[PDB]
Structures are given as structure tokens and as C-alpha cells.
Amino acid sequence: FTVTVPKDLYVVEYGSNMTIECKFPVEKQLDLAALIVYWEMEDKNIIQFVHGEEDLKVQHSSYRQRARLLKDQLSLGNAALQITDVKLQDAGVYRCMISYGGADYKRITVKVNAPYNKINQRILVVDPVTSEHELTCQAEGYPKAEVIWTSSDHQVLSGKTTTTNSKREEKLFNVTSTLRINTTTNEIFYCTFRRLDPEENHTAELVIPELP
């Protein structure tokens, strides 16, 4: 008898839902009476499954509707912990304990990523006589990122970027950047949010519009 794990290191996304899993030997039928399932992180109880029911009375109160176990996976020999609305505090080492005619446990480490993938954009036509436009891209994440502006044939362009702490989540950063350039309907430009260690890129395409 041994509790098994498909992977001991997960990297999940900020604000998303996540599923960690522990597998254990199930010879045909499930006898729910013999079954203990237990999950915790950093000493706090996330889930306790006994007599085939979730024991919500004991769930550390910094959960509530955050955490549940996928009841259907059990019959399969899969204790599957789902957590909704992933916060940065959720990163750390988790433990799953399982008793079912033998006992064992496992440890899974969880990393939370806050990428710059929700990019808000806007174009302002500043002066149509000269065709000068102002392009702005902004997004929040961690850690601090630069913005690189490029033309459709990939020349790096000269911008202005402003970094502050986010007002929504305090641990995140806010990054806006502005490019000022003379240009015409249907031209394409790229703003790329880049962070390092390890390198990660997210970029929006901006199309110069035609206004009356």
C-alpha cells in the first residue's frame, strides 16, 4: 500500500482555479466507511473526508467556499483537491493523507504565478493633420515587468513606462506605457510585457483605426 502522486511541483495562475491530486489503490468497489482522506497546508486543515462526507466543521476558517474535494474521482482512487480563486498566499507545501486498508502520505509544492496576460489597450488620435497617435497598454502582475514597443517589422521603439503598486491587490504591480508616433490607418504595433528569471512574454496587437 502506497499513496502516489503524478507530480510534486505545480505552478498555478493568480485568480484561477486549481486541482491537486493524490492516487491510492482501489480494487473494484469503494467502501466509504474505511476511507480517511485528509489535506492540509502549513498546519491548517483544508479538508477531512470521513464516512463519505466532507467534515466542514473542522476546515480552517480561512477557507469556506474556497475548497472542496471532487467526490467523483474517489471511486477512481483519486483524492482530488480543488481550490477556487487562487491567491498568492496559496503558495507553499501541501500534504495529503489517505487511510484505506493501509496508510500513507505525500507532499506537493505549489507555486503561484501572477502573469501580465490581461492587457488593456487604447489608441488616441492626437492631431490628424500630422497623424500623430498615442498608444497605451496596461496590466498588473508580479514581479515588475518592462514594456517593449515594436513596429510590425520589429524595430524596437521608444516609450514611456510608469510602475506603481496595484490598488486592487497590494502585492502586485501596475505597469502602463505610452508610445507617441506618427502613423496611418491599418498599421500594426506590438506592446510586450516582459519579466525575467525565468523569462516570460505577453503581448497585445494594436491596429491603427480609421475614424470619420
The string of DSSP letters for 5-39 reads -S-SEEEEETTS-EEEEEE----SS--TTS-EEEE
The grid cell for 1 is 500500500
Question: Distance between CA atoms of 26 and 15, rounded to whole angstroms?
Answer: 34
Q: Which residue has the cell 498615442?
A: 134
Experimentally determined by: X-ray
What is residue 208's three-state secondary structure? coil
Task: Answer yes or no: are the C-beta atoms of 105 and 96 closer than 8 Å.
Answer: yes
Given this chain, do its domains 1-114 and 115-212 carry the same CATH topology? yes
How many angstroms separate the CA atoms of 116 and 82, rounded? 24
Q: What is the DSSP letter of 73?
A: H
Quote the CA–CA distance of 22 and 49 in Å, as a whole number.
14
* Class of CATH domain 115-212: mainly beta
Burial class (CB in 10 A: 0-12, 13-18, 19+), 208: middle
**Cα–Cα distances in Å, from 107 out to 4, 32, 50, 94, 147?**
10, 24, 21, 6, 38
Kindly list the domain boundaries of the chain, sorted by start residue. 1-114, 115-212
Q: What share of the chain is helix, strand, coil (3-state, %, to 5)?
A: 5, 55, 40
Amino acid residing at 186: N
Give the Cα separation of 33 and 51 in Å (integer): 5
Resolution for this PDB entry, in angstroms: 2.6
Q: Which CATH architecture has domain 1-114?
A: Sandwich (2.60)
Q: How far is 161 from 101, CA to CA, in rounded Å?
A: 60
Residue 3 C-alpha cell reads as 499513496
